[PDB]
Amino acid sequence: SPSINVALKAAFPSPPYLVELLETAASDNTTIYYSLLDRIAKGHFAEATTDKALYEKFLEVLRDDGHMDPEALSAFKLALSLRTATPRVEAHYQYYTATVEPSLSGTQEGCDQWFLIDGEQYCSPTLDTSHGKVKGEDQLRTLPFDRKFCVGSRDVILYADITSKSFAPFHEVAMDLAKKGKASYRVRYRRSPSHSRESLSVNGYGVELVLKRTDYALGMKAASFVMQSEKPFEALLKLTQDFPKYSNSLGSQNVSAEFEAEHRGNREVFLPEGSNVLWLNGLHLIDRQIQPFGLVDLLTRERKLIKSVLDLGLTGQQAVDLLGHAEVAHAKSGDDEPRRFDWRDDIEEGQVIIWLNNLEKDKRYKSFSPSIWVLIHHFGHGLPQIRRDVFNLVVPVDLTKADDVKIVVEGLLSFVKRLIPVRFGFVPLTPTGQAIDQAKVVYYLLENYGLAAATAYLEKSYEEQSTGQPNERIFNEVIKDKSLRPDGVELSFKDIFISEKHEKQIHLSKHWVERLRAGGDVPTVFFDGFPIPREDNWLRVMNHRLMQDLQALQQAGYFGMLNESMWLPGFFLEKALSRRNTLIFPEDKNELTVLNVNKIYIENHDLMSKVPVIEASKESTRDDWAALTVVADLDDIEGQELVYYALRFRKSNDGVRLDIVHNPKDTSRSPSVLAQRLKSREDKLLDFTRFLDLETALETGEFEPDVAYDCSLANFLASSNMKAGDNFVILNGRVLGPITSADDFKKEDFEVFLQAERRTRILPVYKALEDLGLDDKVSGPLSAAKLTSVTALSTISDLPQGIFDNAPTVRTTLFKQWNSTYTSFEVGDASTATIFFVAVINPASEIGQRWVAVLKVLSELEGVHLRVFLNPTVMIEELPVKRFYRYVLSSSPSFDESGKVKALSARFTGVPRETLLVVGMDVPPAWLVTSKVAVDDLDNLRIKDIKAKRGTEHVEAIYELEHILIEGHSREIPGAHAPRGVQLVLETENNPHFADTIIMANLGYFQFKANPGVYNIRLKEGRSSEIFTLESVGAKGWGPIPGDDNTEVVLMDFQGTTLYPRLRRKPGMEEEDVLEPHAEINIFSVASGHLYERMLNIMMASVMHHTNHTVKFWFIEQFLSPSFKDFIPHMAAEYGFKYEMVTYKWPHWLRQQKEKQREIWGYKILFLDVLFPLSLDKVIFVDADQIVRTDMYDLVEHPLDGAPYLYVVDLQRFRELAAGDRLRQQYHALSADPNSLANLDQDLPNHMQFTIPI
């Protein structure tokens, strides 16, 4: 038979089978994790014979008993076949070997499950007879895979090994520990050493067999041919795998027969040619979203969202038309559009903003008429010239730094100089020390001398030097140059420290900035109310709105409502609110942190009942109803004070379902009695005249410690990601954090939150349902809070807008709009469905085959309405599908003979015999797959040749995965600029100098090479720990979040750890990290194919014999065949030189390539300086053909001076001006259009020969 046999195997060994079940079934359920850990210590699971008969017991338990529904049993089986949760188990294997062992300083007598209590080791299960001691970085770090079994005054850990039966009692020892509310418990799994080197045969991969000789109406003959073989989903794929072979059959048995000809009312109504916008229940997907491992990690949160309302009283069809609705295009189109704000200084008392423009009284604008009607009748793309104040701008300035001062000095004084009919001004910021001392001179000069002098100093300060500490002798100049016209109050001189220039103005300078929160991560600008972020580029946001203000006001003019007696600045400040609560109206207006309120109060039977609730009385209407969750620390003066103001807020509105869950600071102080102080007097709640009435009820009530209450909280706080002591106000699911004090959210802000939330989410949730037919499932605040939390997970993109490539989640209703007949059908379960893949795929596509095979496996899920379409594209001149696919994805757990863990692989029967097929690996974008188990060729897979070469038509080549990426991106504060040049050494306690990948210009790119394990990330001592400092390596989103200062990253998945750290400057120095304050000779070369390998080899032999010195080597792993890998150490000993191998990965933002040749030149010249680590300098790549007779000394010993690089790698100049990082954006501009490169490894560096030297 003619069949290549390709399997994929992970480098890391197989985890035990019982615990693979124990993590997929009990993944995130705090309850379900410790329950499946009891049936093994009972007998049920510890009874099994083989690996088949252990999974079996799980399923019937996780269905009839009360774990999971059957429309997820098959999904459990599927993830178990794909071994998805397997790397998660290797994090415990690694934490033990790299952190648990360095503390473990004793003898394992035979105490299989040695306990960890109070920094001491106890082999004995009764505790008070030790065996060892705990060292440095304590294991009591709350790692997110040893979940919280209640809480207590002392934190305890155990390392159970379930493969051994000795775990049964030792596990039960600390089961009672947390039960009686005495201590906290968590189970971290143990390395079972009795295991074999059983390889983890990974799947979720595709097998590409490209055609090198590819170049010796078809997408319509084949298109009409699937609705002719009468197998709508099974026969669609039976073309998608071997299309390059099955092209002749498209000329035999009425293959044309244009019936789907009238079915060309598809593109001219919904979507153009040559694209596949795969729909998921309402939202749009991309490539980095539609694949194997990167898709099921997204099919469960939608599942949770949907059923949330089929309990309230709806269906899966009446949920897709409810989420993909007209009113849900407000979940995103609403928060970005801001509220009006108040900036008037007359609340401070006219003492803060200082003005450059004075439009009405200016003696430079008199040329215009002072009447209002000037703007009413105005024409042109430009601005309405007038002598009256309509527009206002306020810009804060950090006087010590030169970046913000430069703006008044230039930016503002340019718009004033260029006659803009807008009033520009600013406030002298008073935050970081010195800018306060340099703000008094600004007020001294303007009140006591005039506008000239203050501005003069500012400019003349910037032009001369830029005074860090206010300069006096340059101030004497400004005095003795403009000392005339001292209006209001007269001179003081030199030492400013009086009762006004010093006092009033600086105090009220801070009063006004705090009232509208600007001083921080975002130095926020203003303009006729509405906020403006200055975290990167302010110029765009206020300028687009600038044109939109005048035509908005013109409508009021058109109607005459604008009287001649009306102040034009105080027009946009009519709605306007006092204090901008940033928690309600964020900086980044597209970022609503909402965790489904229905998902919270539903699997926590004690915590969601023992809460002092005040229902939204049935005395009032429907839209008032809302469940303001108030989770706060009532044992603190800035946590119990918000509880009483929220209570007071309920008094005013009968639409408040109040919640007062105690969030205690003190862990030994069992929460329940504090909650019982408010649950005892819950009947007559919010009937308290003063705060003192609430403060006397928290002393009277020494209740019994209900330890059952504190354990359900330990299941809620972890799920909702919450902190203790610090507070968070919630309404229908919307978190505001970190509520430092009760001043951040007074009662006069509880209404403001109800305004915006009613506006954006509350009201439209009822309107979507009113024009639908199910308006009777809005039971009180309850349903309405579940609805306003389901529709919030629709506008939350999985990927922050501006990294991978946009991914804007938009829920619309056009997916199902297309006449559904010829190329249309709905295979699978429909009305009783859970996941709704209403799809639209074209058969002529490079990855459309992969999606046909991925969605085949997702279709096999119980209750899926995978609707399928078929748009017939025509735009092709050469072969559309140049490759032979086969997707390795299985639903029912793959099981072997006596139940062993079976291998999911790929095969090609009856495949072509006279075409070379390049075996390439298309698998999630974080897999350092390398070829290691082969005998034949990568570039050469003719079937007729191997039929003789090895003796049969079969192939026994097996590829090997060895690395799971940690791809990420670095940012900066204030400006989110690129932190490039920074050197970072990712490291564990056990493995110090491990690996280092530099930050690059493309939004601070980095990607660390590692396998499942617990890591941290250092900056190497060169320049980093002097001018740059990482506050938090953002392992938890772009955010930020008050509980993620974690400079620790742990990996145990497939897609890597998407790390978004927030590196910040040390205050002071711009001074770029990219610029300065084994052997002496080395060489690298590229290779692909057994023939390419041998022509490379003779170059290595004719380069370690001609020269009298030491030469190391640096070729690239995956391209090389296993034939070559068992060859280099041989020539490295008899000749006497050194091997070593380097490799990297093209990110999801950089132009990938089709045929494996263009790929090679991408990695060769752009990926150069990052391939080799920092502990190197000179490399001498020479093409895999030449021979070096020369002494290789006058190749390293060669002056370059400005020239970075058949080349001369100088990793000192290559890091100084970052020519590799430059060639990245150089290739980005000349790869979109193939109208610039014949080749890319010798034409990209020669185009920039004058700029980037040789």
UniProtKB/TrEMBL annotation:
The keyword Calcium applies. Keywords: Calcium, Endoplasmic reticulum, Glycoprotein, Metal-binding, Nucleotide-binding, Signal, Transferase. GO terms for molecular function: metal ion binding; nucleotide binding; UDP-glucose:glycoprotein glucosyltransferase activity; unfolded protein binding. Its main location: endoplasmic reticulum. Residues 596-792 form the UDP-glucose:glycoprotein glucosyltransferase thioredoxin-like domain. Disulfide bonds join 111-123. It is found in: Endoplasmic reticulum lumen. Residues 1081-1254 form the Glucosyltransferase 24 catalytic domain. It comes from the Eukaryota. Pathway: Protein modification; protein glycosylation. Belongs to the glycosyltransferase 8 family. This is UDP-glucose-glycoprotein glucosyltransferase-like protein. It comes from Chaetomium thermophilum (strain DSM 1495 / CBS 144.50 / IMI 039719) (Thermochaetoides thermophila).
